[PDB]
């Protein structure tokens, strides 16, 4: 199902090197969420600290749109290896 969809997206001329289209030529809006797991190894001598975190970014790429909401198709598809999208 999912593998059936991902192929269809990249059969058309797609370029991950090209910025996603905008309705009015504006900039791509990326929504960012941050999760901090650990803070450690704070160093006062070297003026640095170690931090491990989970980064969550979100943007809209109409080129990757594969469906309407009222279809039998899954809301989201997990991107498999071998397919690059603009990031």
């Amino acid at each position, epitope marked *: 199902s999912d593998s059936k969809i991902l192929a269809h997206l990249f059969t058309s001329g797609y370029d991950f090197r090209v910025r996603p289209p905008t309705d009015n030529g*504006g*900039p791509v809006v990326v929504s960012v969420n941050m999760l901090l797991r650990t803070i450690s190894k704070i160093d006062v001598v070297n003026m640095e600290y170690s931090a491990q975190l989970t980064l969550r970014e979100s943007w809209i790429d109409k080129r990757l749109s594969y469906g309407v909401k009222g279809d039998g198709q899954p809301d989201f598809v997990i991107l498999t290896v071998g397919h690059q999208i603009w990031m």
Partner: antibody, heavy 122, light 110 residues
Framework: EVQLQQSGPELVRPGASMKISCKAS????????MNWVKQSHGKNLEWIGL????????SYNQKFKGKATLTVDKSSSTAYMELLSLTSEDSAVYYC???????????????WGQGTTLTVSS | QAVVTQESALTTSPGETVTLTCRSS?????????ANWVQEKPDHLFTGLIG???NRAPGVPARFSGSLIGDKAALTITGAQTEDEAIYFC?????????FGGGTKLTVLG
């Protein structure tokens, strides 16, 4: 309090070029970006460019590419705007507007100058 | 390339609530337009009110508050005063440049 005193009004003829000043006071000058806005009679408020006192970096409106040149003197805490090839269209009052955030572009207007009336008539 | 539209002029009474709008021609005014509101007193006096994301200019009264009512920017004055009578300009950010509106001539009847 802070102040943004600009140069006095000037009257010049088409083809010439002059430079408006904007002396800042009451704050760390290198911390706040300066805008320049043009208020004409025929047209609405037109944003020209901004300039970062620290970097010296500038970003102009496409409408005023080459028409205006933003410089800055950190020592005297003064912002300058040079207008080249003045015509009858460039006759307006020019304001300098400060950005509101400290050492970062917050994209919001804080304080304004008293304005500089530039008349360019032949 | 793009035009920002405001109301010609609005009238309000002291103590009441008035809302000034700021409509974009390119579509809905999103948060990346960074709605700015500038007040113009007579004798060419200017001051900033509400800007960018949630920033406010120093000394701006609590009655002034920005929002995004509908699909356009909004400047709401809850509890208007006599000295709030001036011309209010809204500016929208198109990434490359700023664009001001026609400006609204707000009248608070004294």
């Amino acid at each position: 309090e802070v102040q943004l005193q600009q140069s006095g009004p000037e009257l010049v003829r088409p083809g010439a070029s002059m430079k408006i000043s904007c002396k800042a006071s009451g704050y760390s000058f290198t911390g706040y970006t300066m805008n320049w806005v043009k208020q004409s009679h025929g047209k609405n408020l037109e944003w020209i460019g901004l300039i970062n006192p620290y970097n010296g970096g500038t970003s102009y409106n496409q409408k005023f590419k080459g028409k205006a040149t933003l410089t800055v003197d950190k020592s005297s805490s003064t912002a300058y705007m040079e207008l080249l090839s003045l015509t009858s269209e460039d006759s307006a009052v020019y304001y300098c507007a400060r950005d509101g955030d400290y050492y970062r572009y917050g994209r919001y207007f804080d304080y304004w100058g008293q304005g500089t009336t530039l008349t360019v008539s032949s | 390339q793009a035009v920002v539209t405001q109301e010609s002029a609005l009238t309000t009474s002291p103590g009441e609530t008035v809302t000034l709008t700021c409509r974009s021609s390119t579509g809905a005014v999103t948060t990346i337009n960074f709605a700015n509101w500038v007040q113009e007193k007579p004798d060419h006096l200017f001051t900033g009110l509400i800007g960018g994301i949630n920033n406010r200019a120093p000394g701006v009264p609590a009655r002034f508050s920005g929002s995004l009512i509908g699909d356009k920017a909004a400047l709401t004055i809850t509890g208007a005063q006599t000295e709030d009578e001036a011309i209010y300009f809204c500016a929208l950010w198109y990434s490359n440049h700023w664009v001001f509106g026609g400006g609204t001539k707000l009248t608070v009847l004294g």
